Design a protein around this ligand. Structure first.
Ligand SMILES: O=C(NCc1ccc([C@@H]2O[C@H](COP(=O)(O)O)[C@@H](O)[C@H]2O)cc1)Nc1ccc(S(=O)(=O)c2ccccc2)cc1
Ligand SMILES: O=C(NCc1ccc([C@@H]2O[C@H](COP(=O)(O)O)[C@@H](O)[C@H]2O)cc1)Nc1ccc(S(=O)(=O)c2ccccc2)cc1
Lengths: 465, 465
C-alpha cells in the first residue's frame, strides 16, 4: 500500500550523488526555531509506527520507485543499489537511529527535539531521505501546542471567575472534521487536540490514540447529542419552536446542544426557550442540560446578549467569586469564530460583564486543525554533523540576509539547567558532562521502536503548571 | 479498513431522531458562498471513488460503529436499523444521488456546484450523514483555485515581458510535501496543483491522478535534479565552491537547481558562479541549464540583486518586448516566501526593473497546500429542500446578524445566461426551462459512479481564457 521510497521530496532521489565522497555519517536534528514560547512534542511515535518501523523495503517497492521516478525525471536517476543493500542486509529494516524528547513534553523554542543519523556507513544518504515524512510531525506538534495555549486562556479565566478548573478539559471541542484537508489529517489533528481536551466529533482521533499510544482512560474522547441547522430548518421557517420541543423531548435524559440562530438567535432565547418551552428546560437534570448554540454575529456581542436574555428569563445565582451563574440545566456553546486570538477577547468580555466562564464552553474547526502552518513554530530539519574521510565536521547554514535561518553546529544534546530551564549543547559539548543526562531518548533503531509512550504519559507530560 | 459509518461529525449519529416525522427526502447542496470571484470544481470524483462507491456497509462495520459510538457518547445512540436496511436491501451500496458540475469547471461564487438527495425514503437521514466527507472537497477546490489565480498572475507578466506563454505550466513548483498535515493531504494537494501546473516533488499526486481520473499525457507530473542546504553544507563552510562544482559536473547533461544562500547568496552568484565556476556554466546546454536558488531575505530585493549580479557576469540579451534575458544555460528559482500576494509583488518589481519573467520561476510549499481554509471560498453544505407527509418544503437558514450565512431555498439547478454568465435557479424554477439544460450531471447513484472525467478533461475545463 504505502511505499516509503516514494514518500520523500522527489529531488532527494539525487542526494546520494551530491554529498562529499567518503561520507559515512549524516546526523540531522529537528527544532521549533526561535508568540508560542514553548511547544508540545507529540506525533513522532505515530509516524515511526505507521510508516518507518519493520520491513518497509521490498523487491516490488524498489521496482515501483524505479518506474515512478524514471517517468517523473524522464531519466534513470533512482539508485536501486542503496535500497537493495537495506533489503539484503537488514531484511528491509531502515538502519537509522532516532533520539527524541518524551512524547507530550513541553520544551521552549530553539531546542533540539529529535535527531536522526544512519547506523550503517553505506546508508549515509538515508538520514536526509526521511526528512520529508518526519518533518510532517510539525502538524501534531503545532495542533497540540496551539490547543494547549487556548487551554491556558480558559484555565486563567475559569479559575478567576469560578475558583476551580473543574471540567476545563471539556471547554474546547474539536469541530474540525469537515474543515481539514483529508481523513488522515482529521485523525492526527483530533488526537493532537485530545492531548489537552476530551471533546472531538472525529472518532478516528480516539482510534489513532488507542492503536499508536494506548490509554487506561475508559473515556479518552467524548461528544454530546447536538442539532445542526438542517435538523431545525427541515421543519420549516414557521416551525422552529416545534423542532426545539421535539429535540429536547427526544433527548430529555442526556445533554443536548440545539443551534438557535437559524432565523433570530435573540427571538429563540427570549421567546422560544425563555417563554414557550421554558417548562421543558427548568425540569431538566444537571447531567442532561440544554446547551444553546449561537453560530453567527460578533462572537463576544452575541454571547453577552444571549446571557443577558437567559439571565432575564431563568434564575441567575452569583458564585463565591461574585460572578453570575446560569442554572445547572442551562449552558451555552460558542462554536463560531473561535481561535487563539478571539477566545481571549470573549472570556475577557465575559469577565468584564461579571459572567462566569462556567456558563460558556467553546468549539473551533478550521482555526483549530487547518489554519496552522510549519512556519507558526518554525519547525525544520537540518544537517548539523557529518563524518567524511573518517573525520567529524560540524555543519550549518547561515544565510547573510536572515540570521533567524542559522542552524545549530555538530552533535546536539538537550539538558535541564540548574534553575530548571532548558539548553541545547552544540559541537558535542554534552560530552563535557557539565549538565545532567541528555533529555533525548533512542525511540527508533534499525527498524524497531525502542522507546514508546502511552497517551496517559503524553497527557501528563503536556499538563499546564 | 475505512469505515464510512465512523467518517461523519459524531453528533450526526443522533440526526435521524431530529428531522420532522414522516420525512421521505432530504435534498442538500454545496456552494462556494459569496478576492476569489470564480472557483475550480475539482476533487469530488476522488472522494466518490475512494470512500463512497460499492459495498461500503458490512455486518462488521455496523458492529464497529455501535461499539465506537457507545463509548464516545456513553449512551447507545447509534441506530443499526438504518444501516442494516442499506446492507440487506442494497448489499451495502449507499442509496443517494449526487449531481455536480464537470470536474475542472470554472464556476463563479454563489452557485450550486453539487447536490445530494436520498433515493430511498427510508434513508432520508443519509444525505446529511455524508456532509462531513463530501465537504472535505473544499481542499482540492481551494488548492486548484488558489493555484489557478497564481497561474493568472504568471500568465499576465510572462505574456507582457516575453510576448508568449511558453512554459507557463512549469513556472510554479509544488514544494509542499513536508509543509502539509498528512501523506493523504500531500497527494490530494499535489493533484489539485497539477490541474494548473506539472511541477511537484510529491509523486503521490501523479499516482492519485492516474488511479482516480486517468490521463493520456505521458508526463502529467515532473521535477528537476536539485540540491538542498544539507548537500552543500555537508562539504564544510570553506568548501561551498567544491560542493557547487561537484553537483553541476555530476548533473552536466540535465537541468540542476543549486541552493546558493547557505552563507552569502551575493558572494555565491558574483564570486563562485560568476567568476570561479563561470567556465562550467557557460558550456552548459539550453536543455540542461544551471538554476540558482536563493532561499532567504526579502523575496523581491534578493531576486533583483541576484539578476543584477548575474547580468554583470553573464551575457544579457534584450528580447523583442525590450526586457532583459539571461543566457539560456542560466535561470533562477524563487522557492522562498511565495504566495498569491507576494508572487504579484515579485513579477511587478521584475517588470519595473525590465527583467523578463522567463528569467525566474517560482515554488511554494505551506502557502500552496496548507495555509488554506474552508472559509477562503466559504465552501459549505446546506439542506435546501425536504419532503414531509409527501409535501415538498423549501428550507434555508437566515441568521438575523449575518445575511452572508443565508442559504438557498428548494430544488436547485445551474444555467448559462444569454450573456454567457451563470445563474443558480431556486425553488425548482429550473422546471420553467427559461435558461436551457441544468449544467449539473448525475456523477453518483445507488453506490455507483455514473459519470467520470479524465485528468485531461479536468485540465481542459480549468484552462485560463
Ligand atoms: O454543539 C455541538 N455540536 C454541533 C455543532 C455543529 C456545528 C458547529 C459549527 O458550525 C460549523 C459548520 O457549519 P458550516 O458547515 O460552516 O456552515 C462548524 O465548523 C462549527 O464552527 C458547532 C457545533 N457540540 C457540543 C459539544 C460540547 C458542548 S459543551 O462543551 O458545552 C458540553 C459538553 C458536555 C456536557 C455539556 C456541555 C456543546 C456542544
Ligand atoms: O529547486 C528545486 N527543488 C529544491 C528545493 C528545496 C527546497 C525549497 C524550499 O525550502 C523549503 C524547505 O526548507 P526548510 O525545511 O523550511 O528549512 C521548501 O519548503 C521550499 O520553500 C525549494 C526548492 N526544484 C526546481 C524545480 C523546478 C525549477 S524550474 O521551474 O526553474 C525549471 C523546470 C524545468 C527545467 C528547468 C527549470 C527549478 C527548481
Amino acid at each position: 500500500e504505502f511505499n516509503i521510497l516514494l514518500a520523500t521530496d522527489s529531488y532527494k532521489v539525487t542526494h546520494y550523488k551530491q554529498y562529499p565522497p567518503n561520507t559515512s555519517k549524516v546526523y540531522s536534528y529537528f527544532e521549533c526555531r526561535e508568540k508560542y514560547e514553548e511547544t508540545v512534542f507529540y506525533g513522532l511515535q505515530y509516524i515511526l509506527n505507521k510508516y518507518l518501523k519493520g520491513k518497509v523495503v521490498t523487491k516490488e517497492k524498489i521496482q515501483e520507485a524505479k518506474e515512478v521516478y524514471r517517468e517523473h525525471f524522464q531519466d534513470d536517476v533512482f539508485n536501486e543499489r542503496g535500497w537493495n543493500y537495506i533489503l539484503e542486509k537488514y531484511d528491509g529494516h531502515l538502519p537509522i537511529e532516532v533520539k527524541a524528547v518524551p512524547e507530550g513534553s513541553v520544551i521552549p523554542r530553539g531546542n533540539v527535539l529529535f535527531t536522526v543519523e544512519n547506523t550503517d556507513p553505506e546508508c549515509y544518504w538515508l538520514t536526509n531521505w526521511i526528512e520529508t515524512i518526519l518533518v510532517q510531525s510539525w502538524y501534531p506538534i503545532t495542533v497540540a501546542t496551539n490547543s494547549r495555549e487556548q487551554k491556558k486562556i480558559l484555565a486563567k479565566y475559569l479559575l478567576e471567575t469560578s475558583g476551580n478548573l473543574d471540567g476545563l478539559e471539556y471547554k474546547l471541542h474539536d469541530f474540525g472534521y469537515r474543515g481539514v484537508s483529508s481523513q488522515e489529517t482529521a485523525g492526527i489533528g483530533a488526537s493532537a487536540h485530545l492531548v489537552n481536551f476530551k471533546g472531538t466529533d472525529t472518532v478516528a482521533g480516539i482510534a489513532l490514540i488507542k492503536k499508536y499510544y494506548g490509554t487506561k482512560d475508559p473515556v479518552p474522547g467524548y461528544s454530546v447529542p447536538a442539532a445542526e441547522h438542517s435538523t431545525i430548518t427541515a421543519w420549516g421557517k414557521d416551525h422552529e419552536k416545534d423542532a426545539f420541543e421535539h429535540i429536547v423531548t427526544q433527548f430529555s435524559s442526556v445533554p443536548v446542544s440545539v443551534v438557535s440562530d437559524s432565523y433570530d438567535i435573540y427571538n429563540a432565547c427570549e421567546k422560544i426557550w425563555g417563554e414557550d418551552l421554558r417548562h421543558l428546560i427548568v425540569s431538566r437534570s444537571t447531567e442532561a442540560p440544554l446547551i444553546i448554540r449561537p453560530d453567527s454575529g460578533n462572537p463576544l456581542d452575541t454571547v453577552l446578549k444571549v446571557l443577558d436574555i437567559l439571565g432575564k428569563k431563568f434564575p441567575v445565582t452569583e458564585n463565591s467569586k461574585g460572578y453570575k451563574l446560569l442554572p445547572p440545566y442551562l449552558r451555552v456553546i460558542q462554536g463560531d469564530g473561535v481561535d487563539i486570538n478571539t477566545l481571549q477577547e470573549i472570556v475577557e468580555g465575559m469577565k468584564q460583564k461579571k459572567w462566569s466562564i462556567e456558563n460558556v464552553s467553546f468549539g473551533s474547526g478550521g482555526a483549530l486543525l487547518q489554519k496552522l502552518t510549519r512556519d507558526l513554530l518554525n519547525c525544520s530539519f537540518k544537517c548539523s554533523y557529518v563524518v567524511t574521510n573518517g573525520l567529524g565536521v560540524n555543519v550549518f547554514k547561515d544565510p547573510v540576509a536572515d540570521p533567524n535561518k542559522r542552524s545549530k553546529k555538530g552533535r546536539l544534546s538537550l539538558h535541564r539547567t540548574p534553575a530548571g530551564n532548558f539548553v541545547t549543547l552544540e559541537e558535542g559539548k554534552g560530552d563535557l558532562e557539565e549538565y545532567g543526562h541528555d533529555l533525548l531518548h533512542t525511540v527508533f533503531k534499525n527498524g524497531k521502536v525502542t522507546k514508546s509512550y502511552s497517551f496517559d504519559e503524553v497527557r501528563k507530560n503536556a499538563q499546564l503548571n
